[PDB]
Symmetry: D2
Subunit: 149 residues, 4 copies
């Protein structure tokens, strides 16, 4: 059962949890958004071959946005974002409001969602995101991370 | 030169940089504080024998606290805080303001320094801290963390 | 490009180099043997799901064997075997002649292939074989290993 | 208490057990040999500064050799040797007779000891020997390896 350093779960206790597992790099991430994040589904590298990760969708009519990254030369060095309660769909428990991804090759996949909430930032000085874990239900309640060197 | 996952720099760019190195675990942490975090040094476990990490001392009149962990049974399962500039020490750049250590047993060495600034929260779910990195000048300008399994 | 520890290449340099990569653990091994080990392919574990690894099949009319470990309570605790040339596949360079596997649950899957040439042995006290490296032309010319915690 | 991949223990169960834990790299290795290996002590690298682990010496009037590696550019990419009982100093238990080291730089530190017995080979494609573990009484009974990335 090898393991991996898992960091956080930023977000809230609501929703059903999911854990995609660990895999060898990331190739594209897909997510929907409007005033908070909804659908989130990643395509990873599984030993050089793309592996479709499990899809965590929010039926909300939010806007879809694909994040293709030039792997293996480019990869994530930072993930930051906001957590806060969301009245429109009626839930007192925190949700991730906005997520912002940044890569080693200087590109920032600009703020997706509303930047309202309590700030979460995860800068990486050495190490690599190798998998995603978190809670979906109606939209993205929480998000955490698997890492490796 | 084995390496170790290094996450974060939280804080700012001033002061001279230091990297304590990666080590087998953490036994004691010693800090000084009064409106922002100043002196920072730790004593780690170097293969079941206390090894004293380099002294990162501030010269300001700050209160002294000692954090003692019941190593091997007790390990940090968290690190949270506030980075914001300090107008009394006169720095335009963000410096680190509060440092609070939640633990695996259940203890929390409550907030040190003022809880005002942009928030930072590294909840560890699987993996251990094993070394510290940072930047100190007059106070503690930024802390960074080494992680391992 | 997530990276793992890689050890070995116990064998010779002919055949075409293969590398199945690193997974979460090993669940079943299938191979064929008469005087040499011919076919070598494994059914790995991908995040609690079985993932059939790439097939490294050889045309020699060898007798095949399937080795079912009871992942995850059961995993490999040693890989040992013999490395030597083969006058019958009429070849001058080293070929992996035999291979015996021992699990942490005591079971040992007997030398397969005949025990001739120089002996290799890798006892593992703490760690996990997480994937396979290697060379297959007509027979398995070399075998190597990926390990992690 | 972080953990590390430990591979091996080649030799017998004679002698009193020993473990040096793990560090950030290896700078120099010391040993006395003669028909067998006797004393084994090493200068470890601890976070940029030389660090000396436990001395493990044979009282035997064996000849002494200091292997001095050019750290961090040069490192061990392979270790191998011979383990077999000894009868002139009358121990019917497998003891380590020979030690040969290869470095990524192409320098091999010649078979020290008598090459009689069962051969062991640990060649390394990716990873770092990061500390030593083993048995010693009047001569080196066994030897194992700790590795990292």
């Amino acid at each position: 059962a090898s393991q991996t350093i898992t960091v956080g779960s930023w977000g809230g206790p609501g929703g059903n949890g999911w854990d995609e597992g660990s895999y060898t790099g990331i190739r594209q991430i897909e997510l929907s958004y409007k005033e908070a994040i909804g659908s989130f589904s990643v395509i990873y590298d599984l030993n050089g071959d793309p592996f479709s990760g499990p899809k965590h969708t929010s039926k909300l009519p939010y806007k879809n946005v694909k994040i293709e990254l030039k792997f293996p030369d480019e990869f994530l060095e930072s993930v930051s974002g906001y957590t806060g309660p969301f009245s429109a769909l009626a839930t007192p428990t925190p949700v991730v409001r906005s997520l912002t991804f940044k890569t080693n090759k200087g590109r920032t996949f600009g703020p997706y969602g509303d930047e309202e909430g309590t700030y979460f930032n995860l800068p990486i000085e050495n190490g690599l995101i190798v998998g995603f874990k978190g809670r979906t239900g109606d939209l993205l309640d929480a998000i955490g991370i698997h890492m490796s060197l």
